[PDB]
Symmetry: C3
Subunit: 225 residues, 3 copies
C-alpha cells in the first residue's frame, strides 16, 4: 500500500532531520566556544585591565604611559615616542667656558658628547695664594708682611728696604762695596783708612816737630845762661 | 494509524522549535563576533577599522621615524629608540691643562663631574690688577717696580741688579758703622776724622 | 482521505524544514569565515609571534622589550615608559665646582641644561709656573735661581742682595749716592774731597814750617 510506504518515508526523513539538527547544535556550540576563547585571548593579550563582562560586552584596555591615559595601543605608542624625543632633548647636558677657562667639545665613540675643560694660558684674577706667598693687586707678600714687594718697592720687616724714597740699610752694615770711582759713589772703610794713615803721619810729624822745638828752647836757654 | 500521525505531528512541532532556537543561537554568536572584532579594532587603534564587507583593515603605527603594521614591531622600534637616545644623551666631562675632573654617581644614578684646578699651575701669565706674573718675572704697574732675571728696578728710583746697586740720587739711610774694609762708611765715621783734623789745625795754630 | 491529506501536509512541512536546514548550514559557514577574519586579524596585529593554530585555537604574543619579558601589550608599554623615565634620569649629567672653580647652571633654548665653568677670583694653589718664573711657598724664583725672593729677602746669584742680614753690594760699586745728611747716612767719594784737600793744605803748612825750623837751626 502507498500509505504504509509513505509513513515509512516520512519517518526516515524525520530521523535524518533529527540527526542533522544534532550535528548543527554541535557546530554552533563549538563555534560559540571558539569565539569565547578568542575574546579571552584578546583581553589577556591586550592587558590594560581589559575584561569580558557578564552581559557579553567587553571593556577595552586603559593604558597609563607618559603621564596620561590612553584607551588604545596606538595612542600609547605615540605617547611613548613623544616622551622619548623630549627626554632625549632635555637630558643632553652641555658645558661652556667662563673667565680663565677653555672648553673643547668633541664626540665620544658612542656618539655622546665630551667636554674637555682646561684653563686659559693667561689668567686674570684678584689673587693667587701659594702657601705663605700671596700675589695680588698690591704686589707680592711673603709671610705675615715679612717681605713686601709693592708699587713703591721692596721692604723687609726688621731689615733693609729699597723703595722710591731711597735705600734703607736697616741699622746694619752694607758689605762688599767695591772702591768708589765716581764722586757720587759710596766709599768703603779701606778708602777711609787710607786717609787715616796720613793723619797718623801728620801727628807723628807734629810730635817730632814739638820735641825739636823743645830741644831748640832748651838750647836757647843754655845759650843765654 | 492515526496515533502515528499525531506522533509525527508532535515530532515536527518539536523540530520546528529546535530550528527556531538554533536560528536564535546563530544570531547571538554573530553578535559575539561583532563585539570581538570591534573591540579588537578599537583597542588596537592606529586607524584600524572593520569594513562594511566584513574585512578588517589592520593598524598602522608610526613610531621612531618608521611605519609598523603590528604591535610587536612598534614596541621593538621604541625599545631601540630609547636605548640610542639614552646612549647619545649622556654627556661626559674630561680634564685638560691645569684642570682635574672627578667623576661620581649622583643620587638618582646620573653622573656628576667635579671640576677643580690642578694644585700646580703652568701658564703663560697671571694678572692681578696692576701686578703681572710672567716669564720675565714680576711687574707692578706700568713698569713702576720690576723684578726680573737681572734683579730689582724701581722707575725713577733706586735699583739692585746684577750690575750693582744704584741709590737713585738719594741718601742711603740707617747705615751701621763700617767694620770690615769693604763695608760702607757713614757720616759720623767721617765726622770723627773731621774732628781730628780740627785738632791738628788747632795744634798748628798753637805752633 | 483526511489521512492522505494530513500525510501530504506533513511531507510539505518536511520539505520546507529541509530547506531551512540548508540555509542554516550556509549561515553557520558565513559565521565561520568571519571568525577566521577575526582570529587572523588579531594574530597579525599583535605580532610577538602570535599564531592562529590549524586546530582552532590561538597562541598569544610574547614581547621582549626593556630587557624583560612581556605576555601582554600593557606590560610592554609600562616597561617602555619606565625605560624612558630611567634613561631620562640617568643620562642627565651634572657638573659641580671643586677647588678654585665656579660653576653656573642655566637653561639651553631646548630646555636642556648648560654648565658654565669659570675659575674663582682668588686662587689657592701649591705653585704657579710661568715660563722661567715660579711662584710657590718659598716665594718667587726667576731662572735657574738667578734671582730669588723669599722670606729673608732678595738675592741675585753672582750679584748683590737685600736680605734680613743686610745689604750686600756684591763686590760692585754703589752708585748715585746723594750726600749724607744724618750721622747714619752713607757718604760718597765727593764728600771726602774737601777733607783730602785739607790734608794737603796741612801738609804744605807742615813742610814749610819744617824747613823754616831748619833755617832757624842753621
Amino acid at each position: 500500500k502507498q500509505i504504509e510506504d509513505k509513513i515509512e518515508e516520512i519517518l526516515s526523513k524525520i530521523y535524518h532531520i533529527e540527526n542533522e539538527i544534532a550535528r548543527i547544535k554541535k557546530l554552533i556550540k563549538a563555534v560559540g566556544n571558539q569565539v569565547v576563547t578568542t575574546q579571552t585571548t584578546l583581553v589577556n593579550s591586550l592587558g590594560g585591565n581589559a575584561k569580558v563582562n557578564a552581559d557579553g560586552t567587553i571593556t577595552g584596555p586603559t593604558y597609563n604611559v607618559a603621564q596620561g591615559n590612553q584607551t588604545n595601543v596606538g595612542d600609547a605608542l605615540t605617547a611613548l615616542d613623544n616622551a622619548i624625543n623630549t627626554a632625549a632633548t632635555t637630558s643632553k647636558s652641555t658645558v661652556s667656558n667662563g673667565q680663565n677657562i677653555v672648553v673643547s667639545k668633541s664626540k665620544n665613540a658612542d656618539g655622546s658628547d665630551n667636554y674637555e675643560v682646561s684653563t686659559a694660558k693667561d689668567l686674570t684674577v684678584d689673587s693667587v695664594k701659594a702657601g705663605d706667598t700671596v700675589l695680588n693687586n698690591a704686589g707680592i707678600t711673603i709671610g705675615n708682611n715679612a717681605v713686601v714687594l709693592n708699587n713703591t718697592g721692596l721692604t723687609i720687616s726688621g731689615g733693609p728696604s729699597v723703595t722710591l724714597a731711597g735705600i734703607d740699610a736697616g741699622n746694619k752694615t752694607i758689605q762688599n762695596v767695591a772702591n768708589a770711582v765716581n764722586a757720587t759713589d759710596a766709599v768703603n772703610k779701606g778708602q777711609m783708612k787710607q786717609i787715616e794713615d796720613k793723619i797718623e803721619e801728620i801727628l807723628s810729624k807734629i810730635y817730632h816737630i814739638e820735641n825739636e822745638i823743645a830741644r831748640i828752647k832748651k838750647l836757647i836757654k843754655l845759650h843765654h845762661h
